């Protein structure tokens, strides 16, 4: 699965 702390600027619950 993706690591949300690879780039914290990416919010995976957003278009």
């Amino acid at each position: 699965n993706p690591d949300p702390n690879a780039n914290p600027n990416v919010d995976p619950n957003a278009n």
Partner: antibody, heavy 120, light 114 residues
């Protein structure tokens, strides 16, 4: 939003460099600032990031030994420090707000690079 | 790490023609739970920093000409310039933000015939 980086530098091998990145146009503490390097004729390489809010950092296993990323919220500025410089570290060094994807907006700002040359 | 491999390494087409750039990731960057591909495309011109074109593999960045489009999923991705314009000469990079360390492709150089 603008990101303005420190002036171009030259350093002797084994020395250290500290590159500035001043932000403007947005609330400084909301996003993380990354450092990316581009060696001549070689691919962009990610170095690390820092959360401009709480100061937390992550580094690539390349640069973990020799790189330190800090920030000053009052000055709205991020810093990158490389120690034990080698001739292979000659490159352009970028700070960037990489892929800020949120429900409200989606944006990506880079600084103008900072050339550092490691040479005798 | 996730290796990003681009093809071709360079392309040349006449003005108004279609240019296609392929990018392949060494691991899938699709997350089944949200159906999102953690991939982005950048444009870089000499002496300047990269500029974001596409994110989530297929969502154009704001302010980017609509002739730019991203496509693909999993490990196979495509950037399309439907009608190449004079200003589009540059090097193009894919980028993954699925896993640490963040990584970039080797770049595709797009040239204009005239």
């Amino acid at each position: 939003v603008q990101l303005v980086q420190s002036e171009a530098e030259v350093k002797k091998p084994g020395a250290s460099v500290k590159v500035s990145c001043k932000a403007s146009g947005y609330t400084f503490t909301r996003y993380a600032m990354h450092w990316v390097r581009q060696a001549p004729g070689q691919r962009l390489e990610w170095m690390g990031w820092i959360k401009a809010g709480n100061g937390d950092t992550r580094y690539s296993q390349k640069f973990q030994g020799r790189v330190t990323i800090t920030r000053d919220t009052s000055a709205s500025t991020v810093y990158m420090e490389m120690s034990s410089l080698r001739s292979e570290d000659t490159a352009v060094y970028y700070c960037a707000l990489l892929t800020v994807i949120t429900s409200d907006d989606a944006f990506d700002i880079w600084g103008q690079g900072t050339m550092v040359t490691v040479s005798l | 790490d996730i290796v990003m491999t681009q093809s071709p390494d360079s392309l040349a087409v006449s003005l108004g023609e279609r240019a296609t750039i392929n990018c392949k990731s060494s691991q899938s960057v699709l997350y089944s739970s949200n159906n999102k591909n953690y991939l982005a495309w950048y444009q870089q011109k000499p002496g300047q920093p990269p500029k974001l074109l596409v994110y989530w593999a297929s969502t154009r960045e704001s302010g980017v000409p609509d002739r730019f489009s991203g496509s693909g999923s999993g490990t196979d991705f495509t950037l399309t310039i439907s009608s190449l314009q004079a200003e589009d000469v540059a090097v193009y990079y894919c980028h993954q933000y699925y896993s640490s360390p963040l990584t970039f492709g080797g770049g595709t150089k797009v040239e204009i015939k005239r």
